[PDB]
Amino acid sequence: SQSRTMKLIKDWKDIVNQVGDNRCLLQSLKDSPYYKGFEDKVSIWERK
Amino acid sequence: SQSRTMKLIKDWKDIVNQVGDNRCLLQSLKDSPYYKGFEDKVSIWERK
Secondary structure, X not given: OOOOOXXXXXXXXXXXXXXXXXXXXXXXXXXXXXXXXXXHHHHHHXXX | OOXXXXXXOXXXXXXXXXXXXXXXXXXXXXXXXXXXXXXXXXXXHHHO
16 A cells, blocks of 8 residues: 555465475375485485 | 393493584584585585
8 A cells, every 4th residue: 555565475376386296296205115225315304 | 141142332422523523524514605605515515
């Protein structure tokens, strides 16, 4: 109403759906038998 | 004294000095200007 200007943020679903895809992709990586040698990077991206 | 047998562990300094070398090596990596793109693996090895 009074004259200010802020950078509001739109298109949220585009951002959130990528995050959901990445988390279910990590769950898909959790079923691999070679997960025991790569678990430590998965922990990073999990918490991130 | 009574007859048992356990695998006791010797040569400790050989193991510990490698750990000290690795921690001071990480500190040497902490002075690099390109540390901002590789900080996340350094956090892993730091806590480990």
